[PDB]
Write a structure and sequence with these properties.
Elements: E1 4-6, H1 19-23, H2 27-32, E2 37-40, H3 68-80, E3 84-89, E4 98-99, E5 105-107, H4 155-172, E6 176-179, H5 187-197, E7 202-204, H6 223-236, E8 243-246, H7 248-257, H8 275-278, E9 283-286, H9 306-315, E10 319-323, H10 324-328, H11 333-345, E11 354-360, E12 363-368, E13 372-376, E14 391-396, E15 399-403
Parallel strand pairs: 1-2, 1-10, 2-3, 3-6, 6-7, 7-8, 8-9, 9-10
Antiparallel strand pairs: 4-5, 11-12, 12-13, 13-15, 14-15
Helix pairs in contact: 4-5, 5-6, 9-11
The chain binds a molecule of 7 linked components (GLC-GLC-GLC-GLC-BGC-GLC-GLC), a molecule of 5 linked components (GLC-GLC-GLC-GLC-GLC) (2 copies) and calcium ion (3 copies).
The site of a molecule of 5 linked components (GLC-GLC-GLC-GLC-GLC) has 12 residues, from strand 14 and strand 15.
Function: Alpha-amylase displaying a robust amylolytic activity toward p-nitrophenyl maltoheptaoside (BPNP-G7), amylopectin and beta-limit dextrin.
Pfam families: Alpha-amyl_C2 (PF07821), Alpha-amylase (PF00128)
Enzyme class: hydrolase
């Protein structure tokens, strides 16, 4: 059994009294709903309030979300209910606290009294010219324009970041990683950090553009998009690695699918069209996150159909990740918990077998492990396609589930 939960949104840092402190009162509800792993925000000092512009990596006390003691308490509480904690790891780039003689911010401070992570421009990818001194290796991946990109090919950088990661586990209690902007460095480099730290899982955020047609809708065939994600997993070690990826292919397709185009939910081979259909054990599915939804709203799930998104990911193969707001602020808490219970009691996992029964514009009906049937769509009657022996168990707006 495995269900992730994003425990923060874009506005979390503003929480009165601290976000971690507030989360202490949500631990029990989250654990009772069947969640096994909670993804927490970048924990270090950051030039930006949300944490995505890390500076002094060891300075947990300077975070806007809360300090080391508060974080350690929240992780301790989570563990007490058998729930793991995933840390958001932002290592593609990093901000330097001080300026050098050139007047450029490229002299770093790790947050401790000794020299750990107290880097200089020699650790900045030489091709990031706005900040480098031209002496480092070239960037192994994409560049982040708003800050110095780190040279992961540097021996000292690799050694110190691994040491830092191991510390997040031993000192704070973290169990796994969420690799932020993973396309910023090569999978070969991600492999160094993953294999060197033994996380329970390392879910990478590889967000690439989804090919569309003349009408602006994503093309039905998204094989190139999911191939890019599967290629990343193969390069980090495949089945022998703790690495996996967020299923953005399923996210982009489902966004379009629920608008009366449910025929998009099956490929020509009869499989799910996202990463879920090719390598389910390595696919972390989701309806929205702090970027796509929340207050950034870069690619929001159709608001009136959010529960169809959950009826889909919670009953299907792949590893589902519930978004904070949807669980607590949308009036869906009971419905979401009911779906997770169905997944759990029926022994459904990331590798459960999927057999799609109907995939028409206004009706998608599928059977999982021969134990659960799920339907989403505006068409009311799908009675004729429900196998003998099944009876409704959970239902709501344009969705229903049957069990044997
Ligand atoms: O006074 C307050 C302040 O004081 C002190 O801060 C000082 C710093 O310590 C010094 O280093 C120095 O700061 C410099 C920085 O080192 C340097 O990096 C900075 O860069 C600018 C940048 O040029 C600007 O463009 C801007 O950044 C924007 C950016 O352009 C936007 O695109 C955006 O980026 C956001 C995304 O919008 C958002 O989606 C999110 O993306 C993440 C996703 O959410 C996640 O899922 C995914 O995995 O990863 C992506 C990221 O890869 O987050 C992005 C980043 O936040 O917003 C940013 C703004 O946040 O501003 C940058 C900083 O200003 O230039 C300065 C030069 O001055 O000086 C500082 C002041 O003297 C103190 O240390 C600090 O704690 C305190 O807060
Ligand atoms: O079934 C026994 C099988 O065992 C071994 O295979 C395992 C493999 O070692 C392990 O890595 C893992 O395989 C991954 C694979 O590495 C990864 O690339 C992906 O595979 C995707 C392809 O990426 C995707 O392109 C593919 O679509 C192909 C289609 O398969 C082809 O027939 C056609 O020509 O092209 C299309 C694309 O246009 O779909 C694949 C998924 O089915 O994910 C798999 C895991 O799902 O796991 C393997 C199975 O355990 C041996 O290596 C193999 O020889 C044995 O047959
Ligand atoms: O098992 C025998 C049973 O069969 C028939 O009922 C079943 C039905 O045929 C089958 O398709 C399935 O129905 C699902 C439905 O597909 C699913 O979307 C959801 O339905 C929601 C609606 O989305 C929502 O709009 C709805 O509000 C309706 C309200 O239900 C109507 O009474 C009213 O007229 O209109 C409003 C607004 O349009 O509420 C539904 C409930 O969540 O869930 C249903 C299941 O409840 O399952 C049916 C039951 O197995 C026969 O009709 C029935 O008599 C037999 O007992
Ligand atoms: Ca130092
Ligand atoms: Ca950069
Ligand atoms: Ca980079």
């Amino acid at each position: 059994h495995q269900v992730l939960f994003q425990g923060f949104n874009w506005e979390s840092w503003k929480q009165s009294g601290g976000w971690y402190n507030m989360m202490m009162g949500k631990v029990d509800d989250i654990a009772a709903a069947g969640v096994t792993h909670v993804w927490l925000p970048p924990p270090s000092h950051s030039v930006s309030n949300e944490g995505y512009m890390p500076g002094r990596l060891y300075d947990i006390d300077a975070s806007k979300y809360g300090n080391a003691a508060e974080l350690k308490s929240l992780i301790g509480a989570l563990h007490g209910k058998g729930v793991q904690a995933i840390a958001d790891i932002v290592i593609n780039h990093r901000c330097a606290d001080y300026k050098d003689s050139r007047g450029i911010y490229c002299i770093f401070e790790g947050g401790t009294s000794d020299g750990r992570l107290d880097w200089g421009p020699h650790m900045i990818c030489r091709d990031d010219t706005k900040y480098s001194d031209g002496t480092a290796n070239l960037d192994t991946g994409a560049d982040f324009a708003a800050a110095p990109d780190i040279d992961h090919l540097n021996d000292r950088v690799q050694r110190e970041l691994k040491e830092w990661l191991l510390w997040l586990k031993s000192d704070l209690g973290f169990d796994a990683w969420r690799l932020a902007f993973a396309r910023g460095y090569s999978p070969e480099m991600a492999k160094v950090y993953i294999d060197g730290t033994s996380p329970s899982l390392a879910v990478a955020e590889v967000w690439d553009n989804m090919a569309t047609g003349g009408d602006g809708k994503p093309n039905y065939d998204q094989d190139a998009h999911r191939q890019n994600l599967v290629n990343w997993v193969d390069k980090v070690g495949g089945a022998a690695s703790a690495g996996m990826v967020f299923d953005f292919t399923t996210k982009g397709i489902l966004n379009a699918a629920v608008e009366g185009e449910l025929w998009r939910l099956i490929d020509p081979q009869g499989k799910a069209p996202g990463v879920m259909g090719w390598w389910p054990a390595k696919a972390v599915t989701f309806v929205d996150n702090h970027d796509t939804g929340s207050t950034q709203a870069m690619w929001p799930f159709p608001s009136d159909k959010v529960m169809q998104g959950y009826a889909y990911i919670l009953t299907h193969p792949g590893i589902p990740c519930i978004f904070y707001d949807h669980f607590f602020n949308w009036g869906f808490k009971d419905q979401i918990a009911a779906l997770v219970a169905i997944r759990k009691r029926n022994g459904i996992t990331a590798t459960s077998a999927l057999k799609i029964l109907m995939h028409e514009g206004d009706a998608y009906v599928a059977e999982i492990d021969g134990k659960v049937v799920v339907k989403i769509g505006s068409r009311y009657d799908v009675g004729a396609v429900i196998p003998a022996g099944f009876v409704t168990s959970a239902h709501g707006n344009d969705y229903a589930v049957w069990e044997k």
